[PDB]
Design a protein around this ligand. Structure first.
Ligand SMILES: Oc1cccc2nc3ccccc3nc12
Ligand SMILES: Oc1cccc2nc3ccccc3nc12
Ligand SMILES: Oc1cccc2nc3ccccc3nc12
Ligand SMILES: [Ca+2]
Ligand SMILES: [Ca+2]
Ligand SMILES: [Ca+2]
Lengths: 122, 123, 121
């Protein structure tokens, strides 16, 4: 099962803790509307914790839940948090996606042009 | 054969982080622990965190993670659901000990009442 | 299969919210460099949430992701968060560690002698 999801950010909190500006311990909490071919197919919610920030690369531990009609999909990542694609591990899901594994690649994170490419093994 | 369990839940310690804009909005967070009992005897405890991913006046959505500790092992659950007084169902994603390789669901009823319960179906 | 990783704290944020000092709702966010025999073999990142604090025991829900070349390892714990050794559950991984389970014991946490001892099944 594959899916190309267009991601429209719904709400986002970019929490600046600690030292002003992006640094270890900051965190983003967010929700998105998911679409395919211009039709909404579901939504998601997630949190990213900035575990390591250098000027070239802010590293995040991210947790994401996707809600689709057939069920939910759970993913997690420890990756650079940039526009370059990064791949989250799909650890499971519910409904049609129970006991699923696979990968979710995030492109253009935290921009209007964000997309997910899902590859599920089930 | 699926196993069910009915746990009575008493909130132990709780922090409601009102981050971001004061008042309920995206990015707020609850961190909590509970005492678990059955038939009037403590059987374990839990700890968890909820993140408000989307807040509108009609529906505050939370991503929640929960760990239950029993003598027989741990149980892990997660949800992305409205964070209201209505019952909501979490996915059991795994566990330890007796609950190693567990899957299933956990329904939370009466949240933030004295009669809060978890109803588990483990497969 | 066992594995012992030496752990060097890289960046750490200790968020003291609410009442000063450890109490429910505080959180630590961290990254580490992982090494074996003095050579870096990967890195990790994690977050701990203080779920219950009494004078005797600061309980944390911790999530950890270890990144090695062969794959990632996911662990989580609900345990006391002291200098004493504590054991995390390995819930999964990627690559070589896909479908991994087991336990990860953290000793010497946040000291120069921190180590992870993994038992993967
Ligand atoms: O930090 C962020 C801000 C706003 C939206 C985001 N969406 C994500 C989706 C998958 C993984 C990480 C993400 N991080 C995000
Ligand atoms: O936000 C919360 C505050 C206090 C206690 C809570 N207990 C929960 C148990 C299962 C799932 C979500 C929960 N959220 C909670
Ligand atoms: O609170 C902390 C501060 C600095 C480093 C830490 N490393 C950990 C590794 C596994 C579990 C919990 C941890 N907590 C940590
Ligand atoms: Ca900051
Ligand atoms: Ca707020
Ligand atoms: Ca505090």
């Amino acid at each position: 099962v594959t899916m190309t999801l267009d991601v429209k950010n719904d709400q986002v909190a970019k929490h600046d803790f600690g030292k002003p500006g992006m640094d270890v311990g900051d965190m983003d909490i967010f929700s998105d509307i998911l679409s395919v071919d211009g039709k909404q197919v579901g939504y998601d919610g997630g949190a990213c914790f900035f575990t390591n920030v250098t000027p070239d690369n802010p590293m995040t531990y991210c947790e994401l839940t996707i809600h689709l009609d057939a069920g939910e999909i759970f993913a997690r990542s420890l990756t650079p948090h940039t526009l370059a694609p990064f791949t989250m591990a799909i650890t499971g899901g519910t409904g049609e996606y129970a006991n699923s594994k696979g990968e979710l690649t995030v492109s253009g994170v935290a921009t209007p042009d964000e997309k997910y490419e899902l590859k599920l093994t089930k």
